[PDB]
Structures are given as structure tokens and as C-alpha cells.
């Protein structure tokens, strides 16, 4: 009983920590993925302003 209780509490604390920094990995994921569609977008724009000034 005692052993099963203690390694149970340690299973639950590792689970709780693993859920917490998972939430954090997913929020950073979302943030970086969004900053990107923005940078990649800005780029088709600077590369297309480019073939234009280069041809001119």
C-alpha cells in the first residue's frame, strides 16, 4: 500500500509538470507559427518588389 501510494504521488506530480510545460510549448508554438505567416508574407512582397526593380 505505502509504496503504491508514494510512487503514485510521484506519477501525479510528473504528470502535472508534464501538462504545464506542454501548455507552454504549445503557446510558444502558436506564437512562432503566427509570427511566420507574417514574415513569409512580407517576403513574397519584398522579393516581388525586387524582380520589378531588377528588371527596370
Amino acid at each position: 500500500m505505502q509504496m503504491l501510494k508514494l510512487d503514485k504521488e510521484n506519477a501525479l506530480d510528473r504528470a502535472e509538470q508534464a501538462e504545464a510545460d506542454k501548455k507552454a510549448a504549445e503557446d510558444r508554438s502558436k506564437q512562432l507559427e503566427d509570427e511566420l505567416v507574417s514574415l513569409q508574407k512580407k517576403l513574397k512582397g519584398t522579393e516581388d518588389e525586387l524582380d520589378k526593380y531588377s528588371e527596370a
Binding site: 509538470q17 504545464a20 510545460d21 501548455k23 507552454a24
Partner: protein, 90 residues
């Protein structure tokens, strides 16, 4: 950012509890019991005032420490404006 929550508790509680006893230790030293009770009658006279002075003593200091912070608080306000003014990321 919620793994840092356990840091709040530990930190705050820690520092605050440290500060407490210190204040207790300190304040305790500066305290000498009113041991003199029923040892003489005119004693109270020469005694009472001494306590009175000690009080006035402390009172006066508290007032100064006070006015001091105010002055310092103003030093800050200015020292902050010098910090912004001295920003110019140029």
C-alpha cells in the same frame, strides 16, 4: 508561464518571513522591560519622563526618516526623467 507560479510562493513567502523575524529580533533588542514597578514612589517621577524622552526620541526620528523618504521619492522622480530623457535610441 505557470511553472513559475511555484516560484512566486517560495520566493515571496520566503523573503517576507525572513524580514519578519529580523524585525522581531531587532525591535526586541531595543526593548528593556518596565521592570521598575513598586520600588519607590518618587522613582516613577524620575522614571516616567525618561520613558517620555525615549518616546520623544523615537518620535522625532520617525518624523525625520519620514521626511527623508519624501525627499528621496522626489530624487527618484527626477532621476527617472533623466533616464528617459537620456534614452534617444538614435
Amino acid at each position: 508561464s505557470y511553472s513559475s507560479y511555484l516560484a512566486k510562493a517560495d520566493q515571496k513567502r520566503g523573503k517576507k518571513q525572513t524580514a519578519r523575524e529580523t524585525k522581531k529580533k531587532v525591535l526586541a533588542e531595543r526593548r528593556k522591560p518596565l521592570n521598575i514597578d513598586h520600588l519607590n514612589e518618587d522613582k516613577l517621577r524620575d522614571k516616567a519622563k525618561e520613558l517620555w524622552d525615549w518616546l520623544y526620541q523615537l518620535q522625532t526620528e520617525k518624523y525625520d526618516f519620514a521626511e527623508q523618504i519624501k525627499r528621496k521619492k522626489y530624487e527618484i522622480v527626477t532621476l527617472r526623467n533623466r533616464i528617459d530623457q537620456a534614452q534617444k535610441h538614435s
